[PDB]
Design a binder for these strands. Structure first.
Lengths: 106, 197, 127, 157
RNA sequence: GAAAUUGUUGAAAGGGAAGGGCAUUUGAUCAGACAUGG
RNA sequence: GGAAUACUGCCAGCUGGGACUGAGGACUGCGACGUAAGUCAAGGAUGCUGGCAUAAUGGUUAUAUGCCGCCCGUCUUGAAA
RNA sequence: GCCCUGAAAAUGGAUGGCGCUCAAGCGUGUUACCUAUACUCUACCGUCAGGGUUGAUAUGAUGCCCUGACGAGUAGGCAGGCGUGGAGGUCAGUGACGAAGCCUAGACCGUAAGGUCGGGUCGAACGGCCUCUAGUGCAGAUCUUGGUGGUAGUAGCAAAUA
RNA sequence: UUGGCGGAAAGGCCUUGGGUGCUUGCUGGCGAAUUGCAAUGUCAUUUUGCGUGGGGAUAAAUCAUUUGUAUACGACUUAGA
């Protein structure tokens, strides 16, 4: 109980985009340990959270969370696509993100 | 999958190392590259020196001080290859970069910290045998880098220290693998083997 | 208090300001269609302001509703108010800007009696 | 008048719905959810806890045990999409479980005496089964987590 | 007693212009509710 | 000599995972399953549970971040010029 | 065939850049993958078309309802609308218990022209609807008249003895 | 706490000796619910202002004045208890 994590780590790389136009509506996530679209199929539909600090407390907390979910895979190397209730801020390209194991249809 | 990754520059091909190290920064991973002076470039030394001179001719004509800066140190020759592969003028660019350090030799904390290689940028895996190449240290020196010998001196001093260290290590790992031997074949050991351990 | 309506969808909630109304004081924000021969806005080059056009039109079904769900009706006095006697679930009253403070207390009491929503109570409210 | 008056006004009659065609058919749970099976809870208060599945209630949920004396989780509702089914499984033969249902949990602070006694009834039998297999108790007392290295899409459970 | 233009106060940004578009973080500000036995 | 397999194609063959949508508003239509009364996935979503109150949420606004965005008007085959 | 010679120009510099040598190069083959305002399916706005329906039965027949298709645009044509001075008619319209006007990174309606509201300031008149009427809508014209900036506390204020 | 080693940016490393908590090596006795079927539920490290108790320490630079090794003005360089 050194470890308590029940999510897989991921990184927020980019919005969906062509060379010169981006689409903030979809985000591209690289899930740790996932190297192929075949592997990434496991994570589709799972929930993600981006988790951040703020100065103003809300429900007596300075931690905040943006939720979303993995929607399809992306390209040939396990990258995955994700939509969020809001839209990841963009300063967060490179930030860590958390990919849960539910909804589980193990 | 590590807070900081430390790469041994040795036997690595600049551009391919630069390519991987740059993607690493843009994805959030801190990198420090050491031993930048034993980095290679493919194709023999005369061509690479020549190239560096073509780069030397470029300066702002009216004020050479505002025109391109020609960095001669191996670490910094590498930093140039990398920088060109990152949108270094945007905010996100500067952030990516700030996650990265380059050194000639391997200066302390890193000296007692593990280093990794990057196979897809490793020359011996990459260059076809017979193909001529260039040591970055030798190249720098010839275009004005001052500290080849200083870093050489420091490295041998370091390497002596590292040997002693590695020798204690091995000796210790003897005692362990020895004194293990008894437990190594014990009922618990047979159980672990049943589950692959 | 109001009928049912589907989700009110706006479509384009931002203003549409005249091109370069942010550039010279002389040029008011009020929409004005660019006519210039080279104009990037008129020719619609990526990157510039959108212009108003009919595709942005609101759903007939939700058009003119205020967030409460009622069309607003402007209302000068008690007789005016009472045209919405039957249509309580549908219109809400907004009292003219130029109605005196006391005549507002009267329209207000009466609205209340009749169950008619007032959109700008607290008119010239004393207190 | 401040404004002319509309010439129309809509009906204030609210209409009735169309006779909708959506019948409630029963949820058929995935093959691995079989009573007695150990579950890892993925979310909520007892996330991490490894728990014994007992019964599929009529509001789609899973009746869960623990047992309490083993890891502090009481008899409880859990949702099937927030669970991993391990392949490890205890027999659930000598365990009552008939009375437990939706209205059992119905919200009508304290803790009911029945709840506390049912916990002991169900647990005693479960613990008696759990013990016949070495390290099962301990297994269930211990929380689940991902270690560096784990790949969910690979691991067996 | 408008605008240009100006002083002071308050808030904010600013590594060779500023301004704009889509998007969201953060801060500020504003809403829509409306009723159930005591 | 007797097989198998590949390849290509067909099935009004059976199934798992993920994503967007849910327009309509009594009933009329075409059907399906039933021995039957009835049932239904058949001319557009329902059901069960929960969460929010000086709040969940939405509008606006400022700023940051990603990508993108040359000065309008004019004559002109051609204007950021 | 690839490669080498043949192969000389002026600021420093361009396979787009980095850099790449069993390529990240050249020829060829095979899969997978990324992505347009295009294609497919669905919602909504409008346009056009076809169709139904005041038969007695509350509130729009230039209406209501059903169905299919379609949407680029300079010069230019037509349509439906937004807004201004004044005029006939009407709301027995608003108003000194505050008209008009002005200010307001406050609110609401409209695709838009615009409309509406709150608060502040103000002081005498003003508006909606059906019509009528034009000296009726500005960014430009080295446009007119006025007013104001940066330039800038800058150029300067040094001939003629003190 | 006993020794040592580390200057490339050592600012860290190895060591000796006890003390103290824990020890899932192993065997027991208790506890956990109602946070109600997920949602906000582990606290990290930076600055900066204040609060207490201890140890500590007790200056200068600028303007003005002055030199002319200096100087368009600033700047430079001297001198003054």
């Amino acid at each position: 109980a050194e470890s308590h994590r029940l999510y897989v780590k991921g990184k927020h790389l980019s919005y969906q985009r062509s060379k010169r136009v981006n689409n903030p509506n979809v985000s591209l996530i690289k899930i740790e340990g996932v190297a192929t679209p075949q592997d990434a199929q496991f994570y589709l539909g799972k929930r993600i959270a981006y988790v951040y600090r703020a100065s103003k407390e809300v429900r007596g907390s300075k931690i905040r969370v943006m939720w979303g979910k993995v929607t399809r895979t992306h390209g040939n190397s396990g990258v995955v696509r994700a939509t969020f209730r809001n839209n990841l801020p963009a300063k967060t390209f490179g930030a860590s993100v958390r990919i849960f194991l539910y909804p589980s249809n193990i | 999958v590590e807070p900081v990754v430390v790469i041994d520059g040795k036997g690595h091909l600049v551009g391919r190392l630069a390519s991987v190290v740059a993607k690493q920064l843009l994805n959030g991973q801190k990198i420090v590259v050491v031993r930048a002076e034993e980095l290679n470039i493919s194709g023999e030394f005369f061509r690479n020196k020549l190239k560096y001179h073509d780069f030397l001719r470029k300066a702002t004509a009216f004020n050479k001080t505002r025109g391109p800066f020609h960095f001669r140190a191996p670490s910094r020759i590498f930093y140039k290859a990398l920088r060109g592969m990152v949108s270094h003028k945007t905010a996100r660019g500067k952030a990516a970069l700030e996650r990265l350090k380059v050194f000639e030799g391997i200066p302390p904390p890193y000296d007692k910290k593990k280093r990794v290689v990057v196979p897809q940028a490793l020359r011996v895996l990459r260059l076809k045998p017979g193909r001529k190449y260039t040591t970055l240290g030798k190249l720098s020196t010839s275009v004005g880098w001052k500290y080849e010998d200083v870093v050489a001196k420091l490295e041998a001093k370091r390497k002596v220290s590292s040997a002693e260290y590695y020798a204690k290590k091995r000796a210790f790992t003897k005692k362990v693998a020895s004194a293990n031997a008894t437990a190594a074949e014990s009922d618990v050991a047979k159980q672990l083997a049943a589950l692959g351990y | 208090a109001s009928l049912p309506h589907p989700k009110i969808v706006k479509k384009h909630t931002k203003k549409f300001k005249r091109h370069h109304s942010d550039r010279y004081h002389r040029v008011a924000e009020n929409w004005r269609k660019q006519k210039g021969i080279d104009s990037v806005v008129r020719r619609r080059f990526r990157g510039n302001i959108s212009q108003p056009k009919i595709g942005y039109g609101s759903n007939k079904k939700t058009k003119f509703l205020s967030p409460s769900g009622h069309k607003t009706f402007l209302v000068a006095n008690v007789k005016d108010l009472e045209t919405l006697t039957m249509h309580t679930k549908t219109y809400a009253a907004e009292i003219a800007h130029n109605i005196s403070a006391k005549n507002r207390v009267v329209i207000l009491a009466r609205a209340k009696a009749l169950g008619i929503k007032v959109t700008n109570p607290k008119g010239r409210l004393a207190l | 008048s401040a404004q002319k008056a509309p010439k129309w006004y809509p009906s204030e009659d609210v209409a009735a719905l169309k006779k909708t065609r959506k019948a409630a058919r029963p949820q058929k749970l995935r093959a691995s959810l079989v009573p007695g099976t150990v579950l890892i809870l993925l979310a909520g208060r007892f996330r991490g806890k490894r728990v014994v599945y007992l019964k599929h209630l009529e509001d789609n949920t899973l009746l869960i045990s623990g047992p309490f004396k083993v890891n502090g989780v009481p008899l409880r509702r859990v949702n099937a999409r927030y669970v991993i089914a391990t392949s490890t499984k205890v027999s659930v033969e000598g365990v009552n479980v008939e009375k437990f249902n939706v209205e059992y949990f119905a919200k009508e602070k304290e803790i009911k005496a029945e709840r506390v006694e049912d916990q002991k009834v169900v647990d005693k039998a479960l613990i008696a089964e759990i013990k016949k297999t070495p390290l099962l108790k301990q297994y269930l007392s211990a929380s689940f987590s991902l270690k560096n290295g784990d790949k969910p899409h690979m691991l067996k459970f």
